[PDB]
């Protein structure tokens, strides 16, 4: 890898600088290099990895949606060609992230906090693959996302309180999966509502700072329920 000659600590330091500079492709490359050093990642480091690739794939997804809309209205080869170019680049980013999770972040994650984080990410990047999928692998892509999300949910329910922000963000994203990928809007609504209500009943156990963390994500669940009902 092009980051193989850089110290792990220097890659983490530069990922943080890239974040401040809004240089998210650089941030992702640095965090990919850090992962490939082979050591487990800390909570802060997991967050840096997630933020970097969230921003990279987020720009690609937003571009793909613009182009797909234009392509739909048009229905020369240029619009299809350019949508395909963006799609292929997006798929490549998703494959890279899934490859980091499979080689070997997930198997070495021997804490619920780390394992749930990575399994949520696996569901997220299969979900992004599913958003653009159409051919003979779409159904398998969807099932791979569902399986990763479900294993993460099972662990999080056993090992984390209902206000834990990783658990809340997992349930939020699994609900979005149900609503717009799996065509299961009632599952999506049920999951968001149960997650919201169980977190509410646990808020009394929290410090002021944890309360702010949890209620921030609860608000996203609430806004989705308002949109969907």
């Amino acid at each position: 890898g092009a980051m193989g000659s850089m110290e792990r600590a220097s890659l983490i330091q530069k990922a943080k600088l890239a974040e401040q500079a809004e240089r998210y492709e650089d941030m992702a490359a640095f965090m990919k290099g850090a992962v490939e050093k082979g050591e487990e990642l800390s909570c802060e480091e997991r967050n840096l990895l997630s933020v970097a690739y969230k921003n990279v794939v987020g720009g690609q997804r937003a571009a793909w949606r613009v182009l797909s809309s234009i392509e739909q209205k048009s229905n020369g080869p240029e619009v299809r060609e350019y949508r395909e170019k963006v799609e292929t680049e997006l798929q490549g980013v998703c494959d890279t992230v899934l490859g980091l999770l499979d080689s070997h972040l997930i198997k070495e994650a021997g804490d619920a906090e780390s394992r749930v984080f990575y399994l949520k990410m696996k569901g997220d990047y299969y979900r992004y693959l599913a958003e653009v999928a159409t051919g003979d692998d779409k159904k398998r892509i969807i099932d791979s996302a569902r399986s990763a999300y479900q294993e993460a949910m099972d662990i999080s329910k056993k090992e984390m309180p209902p206000t834990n922000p990783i658990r809340l963000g997992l349930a939020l994203n699994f609900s979005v999966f149900h609503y717009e990928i799996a065509n299961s809007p009632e599952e999506a609504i049920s999951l968001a509502k149960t997650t919201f209500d169980e977190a509410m009943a646990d808020l009394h156990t929290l410090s002021e700072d944890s309360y702010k963390d949890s209620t921030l994500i609860m608000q996203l669940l609430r806004d989705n329920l308002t949109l969907w009902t």
Partner: peptide, 8 residues
Amino acid sequence: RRFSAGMR
């Protein structure tokens, strides 16, 4: 547009 965790 619906929210997912990454866009808080």
